[PDB]
Scaffold this active site. Structure first.
Site, PDB file in Angstrom:
ATOM      1  CG  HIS A  33      -2.620  -1.660  -4.561  1.00  0.00           C
ATOM      2  ND1 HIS A  33      -2.734  -2.493  -3.470  1.00  0.00           N
ATOM      3  CD2 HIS A  33      -3.821  -1.697  -5.186  1.00  0.00           C
ATOM      4  CE1 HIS A  33      -3.948  -3.013  -3.437  1.00  0.00           C
ATOM      5  NE2 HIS A  33      -4.628  -2.545  -4.468  1.00  0.00           N
ATOM      6  NE  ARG A  57      -7.578  -1.636   1.174  1.00  0.00           N
ATOM      7  CZ  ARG A  57      -8.087  -2.627   1.901  1.00  0.00           C
ATOM      8  NH1 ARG A  57      -9.099  -2.409   2.722  1.00  0.00           N
ATOM      9  NH2 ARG A  57      -7.615  -3.855   1.767  1.00  0.00           N
ATOM     10  CD  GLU A  87      -7.096  -1.014  -3.052  1.00  0.00           C
ATOM     11  OE1 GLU A  87      -7.468  -1.457  -1.945  1.00  0.00           O
ATOM     12  OE2 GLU A  87      -7.329  -1.595  -4.133  1.00  0.00           O
ATOM     13  CE1 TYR A 112      -4.074  -1.540  -0.349  1.00  0.00           C
ATOM     14  CE2 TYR A 112      -3.415  -2.868   1.542  1.00  0.00           C
ATOM     15  CZ  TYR A 112      -4.266  -2.634   0.473  1.00  0.00           C
ATOM     16  OH  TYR A 112      -5.284  -3.526   0.207  1.00  0.00           O
ATOM     17  CG  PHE A 115     -13.758  -2.364  -3.081  1.00  0.00           C
ATOM     18  CD1 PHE A 115     -13.454  -2.176  -1.741  1.00  0.00           C
ATOM     19  CD2 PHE A 115     -12.730  -2.682  -3.958  1.00  0.00           C
ATOM     20  CE1 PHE A 115     -12.144  -2.285  -1.284  1.00  0.00           C
ATOM     21  CE2 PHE A 115     -11.420  -2.793  -3.508  1.00  0.00           C
ATOM     22  CZ  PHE A 115     -11.128  -2.594  -2.168  1.00  0.00           C
ATOM     23  CG  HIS A 144     -12.878  -5.669   0.663  1.00  0.00           C
ATOM     24  ND1 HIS A 144     -12.931  -5.665  -0.714  1.00  0.00           N
ATOM     25  CD2 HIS A 144     -11.567  -5.621   0.992  1.00  0.00           C
ATOM     26  CE1 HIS A 144     -11.703  -5.620  -1.197  1.00  0.00           C
ATOM     27  NE2 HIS A 144     -10.856  -5.591  -0.183  1.00  0.00           N
TER      28      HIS A 144
HETATM   29  N1  2GP Z   1     -12.304  -5.292  -6.476  1.00  0.00           N
HETATM   30  C1  2GP Z   1     -11.220  -4.658  -6.890  1.00  0.00           C
HETATM   31  N2  2GP Z   1      -9.980  -5.070  -6.576  1.00  0.00           N
HETATM   32  C2  2GP Z   1      -8.987  -4.279  -7.111  1.00  0.00           C
HETATM   33  C3  2GP Z   1      -9.163  -3.162  -7.894  1.00  0.00           C
HETATM   34  N3  2GP Z   1      -7.953  -2.608  -8.279  1.00  0.00           N
HETATM   35  C4  2GP Z   1      -7.072  -3.394  -7.730  1.00  0.00           C
HETATM   36  N4  2GP Z   1      -7.606  -4.438  -7.012  1.00  0.00           N
HETATM   37  C5  2GP Z   1      -6.849  -5.573  -6.419  1.00  0.00           C
HETATM   38  O1  2GP Z   1      -7.163  -6.731  -7.225  1.00  0.00           O
HETATM   39  C6  2GP Z   1      -7.139  -7.921  -6.417  1.00  0.00           C
HETATM   40  C7  2GP Z   1      -8.476  -8.647  -6.495  1.00  0.00           C
HETATM   41  O2  2GP Z   1      -9.579  -7.846  -6.078  1.00  0.00           O
HETATM   42  C8  2GP Z   1      -6.829  -7.479  -5.026  1.00  0.00           C
HETATM   43  O3  2GP Z   1      -5.421  -7.712  -4.921  1.00  0.00           O
HETATM   44  C9  2GP Z   1      -7.250  -5.979  -5.028  1.00  0.00           C
HETATM   45  O4  2GP Z   1      -6.498  -5.202  -4.075  1.00  0.00           O
HETATM   46  P1  2GP Z   1      -7.021  -5.008  -2.567  1.00  0.00           P
HETATM   47  O5  2GP Z   1      -7.493  -6.355  -2.167  1.00  0.00           O
HETATM   48  O6  2GP Z   1      -5.802  -4.563  -1.873  1.00  0.00           O
HETATM   49  O7  2GP Z   1      -8.096  -4.006  -2.723  1.00  0.00           O
HETATM   50  C10 2GP Z   1     -10.484  -2.762  -8.206  1.00  0.00           C
HETATM   51  O8  2GP Z   1     -10.773  -1.819  -8.918  1.00  0.00           O
HETATM   52  N5  2GP Z   1     -11.479  -3.566  -7.662  1.00  0.00           N
END
Ligand code: 2GP
Ligand code: CA
EC number: 4.6.1.24
Length: 104
Positions: free
Chosen positions: A40, A77, A58, A38, A100, A92
Site C-alpha cells: 500500500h 518494510r 511499503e 499489502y 518508523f 517500527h
Molecule cells: N508511520 C507511517 N504510517 C504510514 C505511512 N503511510 C501509510 N501509513 C499507514 O498509516 C497508518 C498509521 O501509521 C498505518 O495504517 C500505516 O500503515 P502500516 O501500519 O501498514 O505501515 C507513513 O508514511 N508513515
C-alpha cells in the site's frame, strides 16, 4: 554483516531485492495480501530524505527469509516507488507508536 539492520533483524541486498520484487508484482497486478492490504501507499509522514521520487509503496520484508504472503507483517518494510526503485528499508522497531525509523 547486515546491509540493513532493522533493530534486531539483519538483511542483505538479496533479501531487499527479493521482497521488493514480490511487492512490485502485486502492485502492478493491483492485488493485495494480508489485513493491512499489502502493498500500500507509503505517505512518508516521517519525512525521510529518499533519493528516489514518490509515490512510495511499503511492503513487509520478513526476518524468516520468506516472502510475505499474509499473516503478521512483522515490523519491517521495504519502500519502493512506481519505477521499482528502492527508497530504503524501514521499521517500527525503535520507533514510538506506529511510526518508523530507517534501518541501520
Ligand atoms: N508511520 C507511517 N504510517 C504510514 C505511512 N503511510 C501509510 N501509513 C499507514 O498509516 C497508518 C498509521 O501509521 C498505518 O495504517 C500505516 O500503515 P502500516 O501500519 O501498514 O505501515 C507513513 O508514511 N508513515
Ligand atoms: Ca537473509
Amino acid at each position: 554483516a547486515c546491509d540493513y539492520t532493522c533493530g534486531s533483524n539483519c538483511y542483505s541486498s538479496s533479501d531487499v531485492s527479493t521482497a521488493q520484487a514480490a511487492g512490485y508484482k502485486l502492485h502492478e497486478d493491483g492485488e493485495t495480501v494480508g489485513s493491512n492490504s499489502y502493498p500500500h501507499k507509503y505517505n512518508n509522514y516521517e519525512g525521510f530524505d529518499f533519493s528516489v521520487s514518490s509515490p512510495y509503496y511499503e511492503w513487509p520484508i520478513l526476518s524468516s527469509g520468506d516472502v510475505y504472503s499474509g499473516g503478521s507483517p512483522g515490523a519491517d518494510r521495504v519502500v519502493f516507488n512506481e519505477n521499482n526503485q528502492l527508497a530504503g528499508s524501514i521499521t517500527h522497531t525503535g520507533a514510538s507508536g506506529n511510526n518508523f525509523v530507517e534501518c541501520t
